[PDB]
Each structure stands twice: as structure tokens, then as C-alpha cells.
Amino acid sequence: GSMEGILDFSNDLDIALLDQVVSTFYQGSGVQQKQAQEILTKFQDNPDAWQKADQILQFSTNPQSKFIALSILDKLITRKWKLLPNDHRIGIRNFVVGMIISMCQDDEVFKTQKNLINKSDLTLVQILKQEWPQNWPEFIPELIGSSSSSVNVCENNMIVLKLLSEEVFDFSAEQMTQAKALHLKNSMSKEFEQIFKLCFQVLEQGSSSSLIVATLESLLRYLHWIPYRYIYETNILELLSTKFMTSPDTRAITLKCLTEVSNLKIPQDNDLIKRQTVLFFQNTLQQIATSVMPVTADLKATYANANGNDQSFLQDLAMFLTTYLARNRALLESDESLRELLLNAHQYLIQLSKIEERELFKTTLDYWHNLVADLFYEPLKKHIYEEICSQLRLVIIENMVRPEEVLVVENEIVREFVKESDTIQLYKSEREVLVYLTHLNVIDTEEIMISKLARQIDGSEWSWHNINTLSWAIGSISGTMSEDTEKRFVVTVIKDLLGLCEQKRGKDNKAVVASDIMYVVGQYPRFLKAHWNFLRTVILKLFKFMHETHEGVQDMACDTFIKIVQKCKYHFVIQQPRESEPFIQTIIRDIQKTTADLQPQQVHTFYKACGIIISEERSVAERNRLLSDLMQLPNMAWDTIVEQSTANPTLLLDSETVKIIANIIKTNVAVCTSMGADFYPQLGHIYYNMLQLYRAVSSMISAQVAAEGLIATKTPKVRGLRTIKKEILKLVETYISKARNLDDVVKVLVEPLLNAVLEDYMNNVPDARDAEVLNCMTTVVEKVGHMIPQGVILILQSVFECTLDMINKDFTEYPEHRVEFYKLLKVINEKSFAAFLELPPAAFKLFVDAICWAFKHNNRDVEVNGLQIALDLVKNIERMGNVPFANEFHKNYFFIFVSETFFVLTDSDHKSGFSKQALLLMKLISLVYDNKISVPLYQVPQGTSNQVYLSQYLANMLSNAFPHLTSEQIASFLSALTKQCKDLVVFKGTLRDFLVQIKEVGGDPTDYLFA
Amino acid sequence: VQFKLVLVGDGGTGKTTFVKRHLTGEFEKKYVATLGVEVHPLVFHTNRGPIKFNVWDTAGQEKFGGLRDGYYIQAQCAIIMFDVTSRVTYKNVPNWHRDLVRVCENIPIVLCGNKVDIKDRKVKAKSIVFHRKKNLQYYDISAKSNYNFEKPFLWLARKLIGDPNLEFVAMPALAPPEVVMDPALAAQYEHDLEVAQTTALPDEDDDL
Amino acid sequence: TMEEDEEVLYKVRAKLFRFDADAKEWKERGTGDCKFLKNKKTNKVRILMRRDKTLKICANHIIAPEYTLKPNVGSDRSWVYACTADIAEGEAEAFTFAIRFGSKENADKFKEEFEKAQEINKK
């Protein structure tokens, strides 16, 4: 309605109308809320709204209105303070101070308007950052003094000090210049002796919990930076570790304080400070045992119940114990009078480790890793923790998370859908600790596992969960036992797991136990390599599971097969005793039967595993014969499908034919992936007809686009035809990236390839171009680019301009072409730079445009390569020396790269590339200050050094782009920046100082003398 | 039984896409920066009754920040969002958290690392620890694949209602009506349907 | 829950879309189990579909005999059809739906069951 009236500043501000807009926004809904929101934003953003701030704080009845008024002052203080006349600055200060004093002395306002007082405190801290201590050196004395006049004021002064400490020490790195951060840090350091007095007095005095909690909250911040003596040379550790642990109001913050105290590294040679570090830990653990919970308490149940703040307290306790013990447990390990304290602390951690809470388990597990790694190396330590470690073996074995390989899950035992990567890292961490624990006592670990197993056979503890967690634990400790103990151990586990399969014979049953046996056996290849008779049986059993109707078991059997093959492949190529032929022979002969019930993706994995085996045969003649045997089925289907495609080239209309072709190529891709350079004979068998097929399917796609429109590219038919092209490109890329005979690559493969792919890419409409063409060409250039200078030129001509036109209208369309495009330019620039030298001057300008275009992407893939291309290009030009092309390059493009780099450095939208942007800028600047540009960069009096002109160019560029800077700021900045162009670290700090200063008015130019 | 939830994080981390997925079930591929804040009600059915979140989906881009921390007033819970493919968005998590808890000093907060569906992950799991000292719950999530997409709201609902055994429950399904098509516009849904028939469905390479 | 007076004639995993005619784009509405439910009292068969983890209703409507499953130009494993009375979001709205399945065999089986259900509702 008339809510917009408050946006008009001709008249005075209708405070009541303002409060209605605010209430409509916070308490409203729907369209009125949405309109009030826009109005309030416009109101806040008005460069004069700050003048209305004090009359809103005087006459408003809505605390949110006053909050928004303070946000308006904050914006003014942090960005425009030094542009205000000095009188407006004192008025704002006095008003903010008075409003704070006024709100504290009204005991009712102090209770109910907490947010509004916190916001005012923060606003006051913003004024301190600008004015303190140089223009207010009595703030801290007056704050200390005023703390006695009232309890509410004293409590609120702790909030102000807390916020100041945060703004100066914790959050200054990004918000202030180096010089100003150091100024305020030194200023607080110089006056902290007094602050600590007030803080320690309040803590010893002890008014009520409100003022104590606020004082401790501030102390937590101080502990980030204050000298050690304030903590160890006073009585404050006794207070923290006893007094304030007893009351639950102060226990949470005190524990966080003691955690911070713990994390410092003590002077490791003074006995007193050591005894004090022991003492506050001893006090803290005693207070927990007597006031909160004894060491026997069931923390798992307490956490699950989640009364009050129990969950946060247990989290904080875990953090305190792990933090302190990782730093200081050695202090407790020698003195026998401290052994109970040491073990009790670790017993609390054992209990914390049973809580059901993944993130909390990771925190304790991190600590256990720290401990067991230390007991694995440090002499004479592991016996101390024997009973702890024994309990920990149980905790980890019973809480193993499902490994990647186990594809069966319950929801009814069915098949996985997703990749749980939050669980991937967790499993790795559980495995690491359990492996260490097994090394520390291999007998205890076996006894736990064998007994738990013995109670699965009995059905005494049977369940999905118990057999699974146990099986995963058993698999995860592979490699910790000696071959002999492992031998006896695995035998026992397998025998007992087989017996269990016969007993729990439902279909869910058998799928659980099948997955567990597959996991275990897949984890013990060393055992398989030494027991061929068992290995053969396992493989045949996996082949049988390839016909399982349960899709999870079936898929897992294929993964276990290739996983075993990767480790045991050598035992499949040799002729074993008692065997009529290498087992690879037996696998190949029955491959159609074995894989008949598998999905195509699973068939390809099978073929890939056969390729791993075949590559172990180093007799070339025998290997190639294995290769042709393996490829018998796809090559026969290929020979059939190509004789029937050459004659009447229309049978490719058949969707069933297109699917058959794609699976043939996918099979070749699979085998090529594992055989690499050894694949070449098979590639040669299909290569010519495969590129002819590429051309034929290309004509079909173009014909369909012409007859049906661009929408044809979405149809199942055209998508299937493009799959053929993409897989062909993938096969050629896969081989070339592993090829060892590059002469054959150049003389046999490259020319037919380019003839088949480049013009087709160039002359298709954009929506029909395959970005995989670019990816294939990147590999070609990477591996043989140096041998095909004319082929690289041909690649550029065919794909450069037409791809650029696809991606230079926005940052979003054709995202895959975008990424592959700049990967291609990158490799060409670094391996065949000559191709860019032969470019026509107009096309070389598009190349520069293309690089700078990459700069402005937010997509990290494009941005990083763009910055790298620019840096490699500059290097490429510098390497040419003093010749016309280099000289013309600098004249035409040097200042384009400097200004484009500066633009992305300063626009606040490309923070992620700061490091590379700075590197590129430092290189560019260093070119001039090393006189490595042998031509004037200008068109200015003659004889001027390029150094002088660069400073003039940059000063003028910055003056016009950031007109709120003074001439002296710009000049000081450039002076510091140019002097530092050989010291990347300091150079970067100076750029960061500049990015701070451009966000405010009145920045001090001497800040750039910091280094 | 409604709770104010503020959602904060760097621009482009997927806050609005995440809420929209929960509102309508859709996945919005386009990035349209939020301007200030967008408020949407969001109800979940639980074994303890319906719980309603008033989701204040705030802007992450500074140039669109609007009232900034003014949005946080009276929030009863929050989600802090970052993007596991953008390290800078994790490095800013402590800044968002600072500004949030200065206004809301004692509320349940979930930290969410979004976009775990993308293969080239940059913020490794092992380096995500900011939540430990700050008592935040953490989840890997993907608004695109729905990985863990419900867990931030399930956890928040448990903390707000005070029942750790709270679970989502199937909403009852009323009998649907028996409506015959309209012959007055029967000659018209030839057009609206033809358009829909010839507009290709998105993401045809997905498992579903 | 309001479903125990019903028999499950057919169940399949699916992803359901709704056509936004204004933006000329399909928009995902939910992924989960698509069920054909026959009311034991009235013998009327309906589609009922719930999202995977929130279990929220994303489809609830009679399999009317006047509906016809059409193909989508981009897929061999989806069906498009117009719905006049769907109460998943509350008030019976009209929608143009598309439902996609994991395979062409699932989509075809769905069409078979969808047409059988139409005969049952033809009574």
C-alpha cells in the first residue's frame, strides 16, 4: 500500500509508518511481507538513511526498527566514516555510547532487549576500530571504571571487550590492512594488564552467573592470543578447573576455556608449569566424576536421551579430553601417582566413543589414531594402555561402517544406489586405527574376532548387523598378521562363514552372507596367491554368482572378480600344476556363458579384468593371441555389423543395431583401459572401419537434425548415434594416452582421425558438436603434438573460432565445450606454441580475448586454465627474445593483460583465483622492471622508461576506476607493489591491503610501507 | 507449531535450490541470485505431529545482501551452507557463523556441505572440522542427487521439538475425486499436451 | 496414513514430472515408489506416489479411463498424460504429468498395468 512513503526523504520520517513496515516484514507473511522487505532494503541502502538513525533510536517503539537503524550506522562507520565531518563523527559516537549506557541502567531493557544491546555493542566496536586508541586513548580506563557503577554495565562491558578481541585478533586478517591490524593488536596488548585485572577480579569476586558467564565468554577470546603468564602465574586455572566446573551455568564456557588453555605448547622445560598443566586436568576430571557423571556412566544412553545441554556438554568434553591428552598425556605416563588420572581420562573417551553420533565418533576416532600411532613407535608406552586398547578393539569392530565394496543394504536386503563418501573417509579412518590396534596386540584382536564369530555360528548373537560389522572388521585388518598366522586365521573365518550360509537360508540371509564372504576373500589376495586350488574355486563361485537373480550379489561378484584379478593376475596367465592350461584360457573359452546374464556395463568390467590378466603375458606373440581370443565375440559382431552397414548404409536406422555397435566399442574401451599400449593390435583390426562408421553415423545425425530440427538431438535415436561417436573418441583417446609407440600414432592413427573428426565438428550446428572431440584432441596434442605441427594448426582452424563463438555470449551455455576448450588451448600453448604464431593477426586477437574471457569465469575449471594460459603465453613470448612478434605482442596486449588481471583482482567476484591472478600480475610487472620489454609501451615524451610509463598508466587506471581513492593512496600502493614484484608473498599482502582500502574512504597511504 | 529457520552461506552454494527441492520437488539448474531474502513456509509430517519451518532463504552475494544480519532476528534454528567443490565457501563458514550467533546466541545449527554429487570434490571430508568446537551438526548433502537432503530438517525438528526419536511419517492420502474431462476445452488440451509431448524431459542419462 | 483399505495392484520406482506451460519446461515433482491402489470398498483404482525420504505425496488421482499415455520425444522410458484432478498438493488441480522409469521394460509394464486399471475403473 502506502508503505513506500518512508522512501521519500523530502518530508520528515514517519516513525510509526516505519515501525509498521518493519512489523509487516518480521511478523507478516505473503505479499505484504515481500513488499515490506523490498521497501526496507531500499530504505537501508539510501546513502542518507544514516541521518534518520538517531531519530529512529529516539522515538521508535519497535526493537527491530532500532536494529535496522544500527545496521545503517554500521555500513556508514565501516565504509564512509572518514568522509564525515568531524562533528558528525563525535555526534554518532556520543549517541551510540549514550544509548548503550541508557539501555544498561534500565534493568527492564537490559533483560528483554539483549539482541539490540549486542548490536549496539558491535556498532561501538566498529567505532573503536576507526577511532581507538589514537582518538580515544581513555576508552579502556573509563570502561574499567564504569564497571563498578553497575552490574549490568560491568556485564555489558565484557560483551564489548569480547567483540573487540574477536574483531582485532580473530577476524582482522581479511577486514583490515596489515598495518592497521598490527596497530590494534599492539593497542590491546598494551592495555590488557588492566583488562585482565577487571576480569580476574570479577571471577574471584563472583557476583551472579550472568556476569560470570559473560566474563568467561570474553576470556575464551583472550586465550587465543594473550601471553602464557596471565594463565599460569595467576590463580585463574584453579578457578576454572574447580569453582566454575561445579555450576552448570558456567561449566560449558569453562570447559571451552580449558580446551583453549590445553592446546598451547608449554615451555617444555619448567617443572612448575608442567605441574600446573597436570593440576588443572586433575581438578577438571575430579569435578566431572563428582558433579556430572562417574567414569562408568552410560554416555551412549545419556547422549541418546538428549536432556538439556547434555549433547553439547559431551561434545565439549570429548574436545577437551582429546585436545589435552594429544598435547600432554606424556606428563601423566611416568609418575605412578598419575596413572589413574591418565586411565580415567581415557576411560571417559572409551565411553564417549560408544555414542551414536557420526561426527562425534570421528572426533574421538581422530584422537585414537593419534594415540595408537604413538604407541606403535614410542618405546615402553603401549603396555600402559593395554586395557584401553582392548576395549577400543571392541568399540571399533562393533561400529565398522559399510565399506565401498559391499553393495547390498537393508531397507529387505537390496542394492545400493549412491556412493556414500561421508562414509568412505570414515571407513578408511576406522581401518587405520584397527590396523594399528592389531599390530599392537595381534593375539587379542584374533581372539575377539574368532570368539564373536563363534557366537554367530551358534546363532547366539546372529543378526544382519553383527555378522556384517564383524566381516568388515575381519577384511579391514588384512596385512597385519604374518602369512602363517593369516593362513590359519583366514581358513577359520572362511570355514565358519560357509557354515553360516547353510544355516540362514532365506534369500535375504544368503545375500548378506554372500556379500560378507565376497568382501573378506577379496581383502586377502596374499592368501589367494598361495592357495591356487582355493583361488580357482573362488573365481568359479563368483562366475556362478554372475547368474544370481539378486542384482546386488551379482554386481558385487563382478567387482570382487576384478578386484581379485588386479592383485592375483599373475596366477591366471601361468600354467598351474595339475592344470591343463593357463586359467585365462578357461575364462576366455566360456566368456559367453559366464557373462550371459550380466548387464552390458558388467560385461565390460569382465572384459576389462581379462585385459589385466592378458597384459601380464610379456611374450608378444602369446599376448596378441590372447587378445584376439578375448575379442572373438565383439570382433565377430563387428565384422557382421560392418559388412551389413557398408552394403545399404541404412541398417543403422535400427535402434537395436545402434545399441549393439555402442556395446562393441565400449568393450574395446574396457579392454584398452587395462591393456594400454598392448591394445594396439586389436585397435588396428577395427580402426579403419571404425572411422568410416564414425563418418556414417555423423551423416545420420546431421540428416536427422535437418529433417526434424534441433529437437532431434534429444531423441533416443540420435543420442544413441552420438554415443557411438563419443565411445569411438574415447577409445582413440584411451589408447593414445597410454601408447608407447608414438611413431605408429603419428603415421597410422592421427591423419585418418583428424580427417574423420575435425571438419565434421566444424561443419555441424552447435547443438550437434561433441565436446569429446576437444577432449580427444587435447590428448593427441599432449602426446604427439610436438611431432605434428601441421596437424595442430589443423585442429585450431577447425575448432577454435567456432567453439569460441559457442561460449562467448554467456558463462553458462555449453559447459562441457567450455571446459574442454580451454584444456585444449592450454596444451597447445605449452606444447605447440608455434601454432599460435602462424595464426592470422585477427585470430590471435580472438585468442587473447578467449584467455581474458576465461579469467572472468567463476567456474574454477575454466578460470584456473585461463590464468595458466596467460602466464604460459607471457613466458612463451618472453622466450622469443627481442624479435618483431614479441615486440608487437607487448605493444598490442601487455596493458590488456595488466588491466584485465587487475579487474578480476578487484571486482570481489573472483576471490578463488587470487593466488594465480597475483602471480600473473607480478610476472607482468616484473617484465617491465627487468627491462625485458625492448620496445616503448607508449605511443608521452620520448626516452621515457617503460617503468615510468607503467606507473603513469596504472595510476590513471586506478584513479578512474576507484575515484574515491586519493592520489597518494594510489601512488603509495603502486610504489610498494612495483618494489615487491620479486617477492610473491609480500606482493600478495600488498594486493590484499589494496582490496581492503578500496572498500572504505580515507585509507592511510603509509599502510603500504608495512613490509 | 512453526519455527523460524535462517539459511546462510556464500552465493552459489545451493541454498535456494535446496529449499526449492523441499518445497516443490524440483531441481532448478539455473543460478538466479537471491535478492535479500525469500521466505517460504515448509511443513513436515512427523510422528509427533506437523512441524512448520518458516524458511528465510537469505542472499549469499554481498551486493545482494539486503538487511544482512537483520534477517537473523528471532530465528529459532539455522542452516549454514557451503559448496564442497569451492574451498573459498568453506573458508567463509566461520564468517557466516560469527554473524549468525552474534544475533542468535543459542539455537540449533546444521552445517551442510552441498554438491557432493560432483566428482571433482575440493573440500575434503577430513578437513571439515569447524562444527566440532561450535556444536553444529554436519552433513554431506546434494540438492541434485537428494543425498542426505532430509537430514538437516530431521535433525532440526528433533532438537526443536525435544524428541530424539521423532521421525518423518507418511501423510494420509485422501480419496481422489472422480472428475470427467471438460469437453468445452477438450479440443484445447491437444495443444498444451502437444507442447509437453515435444519438450524433452531433462537429464535423460540419469538412472531415473 | 489412509491407505489400509486398499490393495497394491502394482508398484514401481519412478520419477514424476509436471509441465510448467508458462516456462515451457518440465519440472521434477518427486522420486519414489509409484503405486496402483484399488479401494476395497469402491473398487476404484488410483495412482499414489510418495517421495523417497520425506514420504510426501507427489501424486494422488484416479486412473481415469479417459486418460491416454503418450511418449515424450526425448525418452523411450517415459509416458506423458494429462490429469484433471490431482490432490497431492491439496485442492484438485489439473496437471500435465510425465513419469519416467529405470528402463523401457518398466515403462512398458507400467502402460500395461495403467490400462488394466482403466478397465477396472470402467465399472
Ligand SMILES: Nc1nc2c(ncn2[C@@H]2O[C@H](COP(=O)(O)OP(=O)(O)NP(=O)(O)O)[C@@H](O)[C@H]2O)c(=O)[nH]1
Ligand atoms: N551439481 C549440483 N548443483 C547444485 C546443487 N545444488 C545447487 N546447485 C546449483 O548451484 C547453483 C546455485 O543455485 P542456488 O540454489 O540459487 O545457490 P544460492 O546459494 O541460493 N545463491 P545466492 O546465495 O546468491 O542467492 C545452481 O546452478 C544449482 O543448479 C547440487 O546439489 N548439485
Ligand SMILES: NC(=O)[C@@H](Cn1cnc(-c2cc(C(F)(F)F)cc(C(F)(F)F)c2)n1)c1cncnc1
Ligand atoms: N552354501 C552356499 O554356497 C551358500 C553360502 N555361500 C555363499 N557364498 C559362498 C561362497 C562365496 C564365495 C565368493 F567369495 F567367491 F563369493 C566363495 C566361496 C568359496 F569359498 F566356496 F570359495 C563360497 N558360500 C550360498 C549363499 N548364497 C548364494 N549362494 C550360495
Ligand SMILES: [Mg+2]
Ligand atoms: Mg539463493
